[PDB]
């Protein structure tokens, strides 16, 4: 009830049912962009780039992926929390969660590859969104992320 499914170009997400859409480009490969109506910085996109790799492993560790990816995240501070990795039909995805300061943002990256693209899905809140009860809306968001 509290999320909605997006059906998506080769993925699927969950996304919180409150957010709208926001067709402003931030990120390069955006695809998606959804966003609290009272608060942009609880957001989510979806980005998909070409890519030459077969799995998010050849990248290295998920640590080592983020950092070639930075443009991810003026960040003057950024904190890898947790990092996590899953299979699913074969396939490798990475899960970081992130502390950013330039108080901080949450931030929450999946990552995966499959033909020839690489497939990254971030969601974030501020801290006044940061609560029991409201962190799904970042990390179940997240998390949801698969090639469909
Ligand atoms: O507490 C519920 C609310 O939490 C967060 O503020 C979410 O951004 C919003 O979509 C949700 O309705």
Not at 24 to 47: C, H, K, M, W
Not at 51 to 75: C, H, M, N, R, W
Not at 91 to 96: A, E, I, S
Not at 120 to 129: E, H, M, P
């Amino acid at each position: 009830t509290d999320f909605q499914t997006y059906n998506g170009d080769g993925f699927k997400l969950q996304i919180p049912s409150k957010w709208n859409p926001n067709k402003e480009v931030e990120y390069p490969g955006q695809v998606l962009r959804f966003e609290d109506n009272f608060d942009a910085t609880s957001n989510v996109i979806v980005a998909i780039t070409p890519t030459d790799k077969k799995s998010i492993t050849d990248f290295g560790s998920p640590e080592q992926f983020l950092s070639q990816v930075d443009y991810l995240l003026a960040v003057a501070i950024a904190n890898v929390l947790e990092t996590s990795t899953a299979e699913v039909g074969g396939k490798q995805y990475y899960y970081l969660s992130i502390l950013t300061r330039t108080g901080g943002k949450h931030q929450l990256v999946t990552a995966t590859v499959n033909d020839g693209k690489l497939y990254i899905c971030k969601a974030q809140a501020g801290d006044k969104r940061w609560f029991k009860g409201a962190k799904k809306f970042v990390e179940n968001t997240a998390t949801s992320f698969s090639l469909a």
